[PDB]
Design a protein around this ligand. Sequence first.
Ligand SMILES: *[C@@H]1O[C@H](CO)[C@@H](O)[C@H](O)[C@H]1NC(C)=O
Ligand SMILES: *[C@@H]1O[C@H](CO)[C@@H](O)[C@H](O)[C@H]1NC(C)=O
Ligand SMILES: *[C@@H]1O[C@H](CO)[C@@H](O)[C@H](O)[C@H]1NC(C)=O
Ligand SMILES: *[C@@H]1O[C@H](CO)[C@@H](O)[C@H](O)[C@H]1NC(C)=O
Ligand SMILES: *[C@@H]1O[C@H](CO)[C@@H](O)[C@H](O)[C@H]1NC(C)=O
Ligand SMILES: *[C@@H]1O[C@H](CO)[C@@H](O)[C@H](O)[C@H]1NC(C)=O
Ligand SMILES: *[C@@H]1O[C@H](CO)[C@@H](O)[C@H](O)[C@H]1NC(C)=O
Ligand SMILES: *[C@@H]1O[C@H](CO)[C@@H](O)[C@H](O)[C@H]1NC(C)=O
Ligand SMILES: *[C@@H]1O[C@H](CO)[C@@H](O)[C@H](O)[C@H]1NC(C)=O
Ligand SMILES: *[C@@H]1O[C@H](CO)[C@@H](O)[C@H](O)[C@H]1NC(C)=O
Lengths: 470, 462, 50
Amino acid sequence: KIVNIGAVLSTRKHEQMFREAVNQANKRHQLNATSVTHKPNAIQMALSVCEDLISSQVYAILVSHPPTPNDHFTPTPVSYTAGFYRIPVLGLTTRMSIYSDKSIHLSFLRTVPPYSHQSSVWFEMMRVYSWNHIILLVSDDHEGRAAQKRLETLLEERESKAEKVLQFDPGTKNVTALLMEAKELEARVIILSASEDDAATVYRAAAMLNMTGSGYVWLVGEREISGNALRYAPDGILGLQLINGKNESAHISDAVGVVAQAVHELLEKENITDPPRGCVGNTNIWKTGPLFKRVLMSSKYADGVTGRVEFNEDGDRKFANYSIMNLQNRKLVQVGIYNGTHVIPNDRKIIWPGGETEKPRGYQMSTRLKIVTIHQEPFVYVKPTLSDGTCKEEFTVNGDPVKKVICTGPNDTSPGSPRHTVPQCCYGFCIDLLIKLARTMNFTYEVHLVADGKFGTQERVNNSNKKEWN
Amino acid sequence: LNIAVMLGHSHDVTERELRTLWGPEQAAGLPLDVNVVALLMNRTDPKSLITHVCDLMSGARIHGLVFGDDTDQEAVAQMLDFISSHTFVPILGIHGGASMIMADKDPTSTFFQFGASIQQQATVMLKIMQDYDWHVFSLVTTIFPGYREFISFVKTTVDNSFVGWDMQNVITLDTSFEDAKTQVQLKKIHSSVILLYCSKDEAVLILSEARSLGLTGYDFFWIVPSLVSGNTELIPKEFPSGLISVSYDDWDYSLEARVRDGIGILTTAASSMLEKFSYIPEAKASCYGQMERPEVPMHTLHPFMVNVTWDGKDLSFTEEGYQVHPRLVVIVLNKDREWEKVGKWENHTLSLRHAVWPRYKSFSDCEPDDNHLSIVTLEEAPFVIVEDIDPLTETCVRNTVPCRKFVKINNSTNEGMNVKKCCKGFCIDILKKLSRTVKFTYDLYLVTNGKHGKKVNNVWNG
Amino acid sequence: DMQNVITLDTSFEDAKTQVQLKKIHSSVILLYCSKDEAVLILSEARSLGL
Ligand SMILES: *[C@@H]1O[C@H](CO)[C@@H](O)[C@H](O)[C@H]1NC(C)=O
Ligand SMILES: *[C@@H]1O[C@H](CO)[C@@H](O)[C@H](O)[C@H]1NC(C)=O
Ligand SMILES: *[C@@H]1O[C@H](CO)[C@@H](O)[C@H](O)[C@H]1NC(C)=O
Ligand SMILES: *[C@@H]1O[C@H](CO)[C@@H](O)[C@H](O)[C@H]1NC(C)=O
Ligand SMILES: *[C@@H]1O[C@H](CO)[C@@H](O)[C@H](O)[C@H]1NC(C)=O
Ligand SMILES: *[C@@H]1O[C@H](CO)[C@@H](O)[C@H](O)[C@H]1NC(C)=O
Ligand SMILES: *[C@@H]1O[C@H](CO)[C@@H](O)[C@H](O)[C@H]1NC(C)=O
Ligand SMILES: *[C@@H]1O[C@H](CO)[C@@H](O)[C@H](O)[C@H]1NC(C)=O
Ligand SMILES: *[C@@H]1O[C@H](CO)[C@@H](O)[C@H](O)[C@H]1NC(C)=O
Ligand SMILES: *[C@@H]1O[C@H](CO)[C@@H](O)[C@H](O)[C@H]1NC(C)=O
């Protein structure tokens, strides 16, 4: 009646704890256990996993993140080796979203939500605080891409879209060119998604550009407020943390309970094929592997240490507790707790960047209204200005002065020319209407022509099938 | 200077020694001489594959690798990607499982495959629809890894096209074989083209339910990705006849060509690296080198891989890691229940073989066509005038009708190609009005044998 | 305008009945069936959008 199970842990003490926990689970309701520590060389580590657990015919592999802070150090080789036989592994403390793509990792159930799921929390923070116009800073990795995709596919339901989405490159130390673009936007709330080093770099770049002043609100992921970022984060960061996210012990206990429950459910089913005894010399998919993964992905464990353990369709834990954290005097302070589809605040004060104690709406009205205008004869006359700086002062037949604007457009009307953005003087019917609107609409217009010099239709992109507006 | 070629020797019986003799000895005079070490794998076990690749990296100091197995398992691609990422050796899978392409590869990994990504399959699907005037379709997907990416790409291509498709409901079956919400969701399909996207096992159930619901017939065409027709030798009984699918070329461009192309690609990349960097790359001492942390101070081979030309064909690779010019042969379930080619993906054109749809009959219990008609016409009078398809959004745009002529190839060549044209006029408007009122479908085509008609030797013409 | 008259002898769970009942594009339906068959026909129509 032996049912084996395998696990790869960070240290021997955690291995002994896992053995004690699995013994307690067995005593609660005939089930073996084995363990092995991590190894530096990924290839050798995977070979050891293969030759130790697979030779022992395990049913699941409990994999946990190692002490060293290296991305994809533990899970990827173990996940690949197990998914070769469709043996379902249980991640413990790895929040990278690359494991949420079942196309690559065929069998990977984990008991912590990914970093991408934090996107949903942002929506909740945008709901209670009534924020609709946001900007989103995202790295060009799978993690950032996944976070952006989740946020967009969850925001499109509310018929809302981000004001701008700005991409990164994983390692660039110069992002001020992008913060310059971020300056000229009405949305004044920034949602970051980047690693600790990239978070520190963007914090350093934004500090010199006064994006940390009053009227700005920052929403920042869990891993972008820990470490060096915590040293450079401005006051008022609305970061997130997991409840017992780093607690390997609670996750180990909860995962072994879930796996024991799933094994008990499985052995009561119809004929079940044993897992292959030897990793070497075997190239067949474990026929009951997909069934075991399916029953794992649907088992409900409402008696867990970390609360109810329910997996979503993608194979990741759902309804996880997120704790909000505001940075005050260079020290994180608990503010609220989000459990699921609802964020709850507390009596602790929330000081936004700049020291404001209100709920600053990040919708700078701006009222600049950069205006384009085509040169049309009866409506918008365009003429060269004088050397004094301003265009001359004509007069109407009735003696009234004619209103003129400092148009910024290209002198060379000839196509295929090095267009020079020189200021002409433009005036006329449409210009007079614009003056009336500005006088009544509080406008501060910056009129400028169009480089194309055309009204603009939907032109097909050169050597493509995409529509484009000129 | 050293290239390793590894096979599974299952689907390659004669290639046990044929791979060794087939090298770039006379294929090209590359500036760098390379020797091909041929290996055969009894089984592609993970530990066994790790050991074999590590031995090949240690012994003979290979500068690259070409891998192709007969296994249908998809984990081989993942394992190869991981090995390429850690060992720092360029690995390409010419055939079988290694052929399958993973959505996302590790940035460190230098793994390349000959397969086609789901984006390319979707775009050739939409090209098939455009070439057959199937401008109304109802995308349906199950909960399968990669369904969200496929749906998003299809929607984006729909929104950014001048063709203007009437993309209807995009159903997502949250649970196959549920028979509770799947039935009511499928019953809303009033369209004529369905982009099924499901696993090979789940697609059988979906198609059986569709037949048991009335969604299979003459007026319904199912276009289907490669992963549903992965094994063309196993055709389930529930698969409807004339079911369009897009896959890689199993028939033409085989091993004797796949391995040649892979070796040529690797040699061209090495030559480009030598042209850019005077020093040649040095292989890692061993994979089991846990104590010593390695690196790649020299530039890796991705740039070389991109701008690669060999034996005329452009076997370049995209920035993501997909082949720029895949094969992507279109196939259809013939009335004899055997997949057959009806078009090979070209440079950037569909190159369909059937100008007019075959109108394949589904399961033998289906009714005959009492509404579809074949109509012959002459494009001489102003009542019927032909016109080439419009440049932007190539199709019959406003008042014209798909209208195929039989144009003789060249001048003296007896070959004749059925070209699709848009013919309009007074009689075409009459036909359109008649179809609208009488409620029938037509397949217009011009006549080739003479004018309106004359009795020649008691045989009618035209 | 009377059109698309439908008469089904292929029962209600088959495919012929589904394809024939899908033809009803009108907003008014003159049903004629037994009491036992009427509930099945209306259930099939409800699961179809009519
Ligand atoms: C249980 O697994 C252990 C490995 O830690 C193994 O030594 C032992 O033989 C197994 N128990 C039995 C009786 O199979
Ligand atoms: C790079 O950084 C320097 C100083 O940090 C800055 O002056 C320069 O504008 C940056 N480059 C770009 C393209 O913004
Ligand atoms: C940022 O603020 C400081 C102090 O308020 C000021 O000296 C500096 O000029 C500002 N820089 C920009 C780019 O606004
Ligand atoms: C958190 O970890 C500590 C020690 O690592 C442990 O004592 C405690 O029980 C854990 N929390 C829970 C809820 O188990
Ligand atoms: C989350 O925390 C609340 C109270 O802090 C608790 O009632 C709930 O059970 C927790 N849920 C989980 C899944 O930990
Ligand atoms: C937990 O979520 C429920 C809804 O599922 C919500 O009503 C409640 O406020 C939350 N409880 C707390 C305080 O975590
Ligand atoms: C337009 O005119 C100004 C002054 O007449 C001249 O300096 C400028 O070079 C002209 N534009 C171009 C593109 O040459
Ligand atoms: C807007 O216009 C009103 C005129 O009624 C004026 O009092 C106010 O100062 C204007 N505000 C701005 C920002 O220009
Ligand atoms: C590299 O690309 C250029 C043009 O982009 C082309 O002319 C050249 O032939 C390419 N090199 C090789 C080795 O194909
Ligand atoms: C092949 O495609 C390329 C890029 O689309 C194009 O430049 C070239 O002219 C094409 N050649 C032929 C023969 O179609």
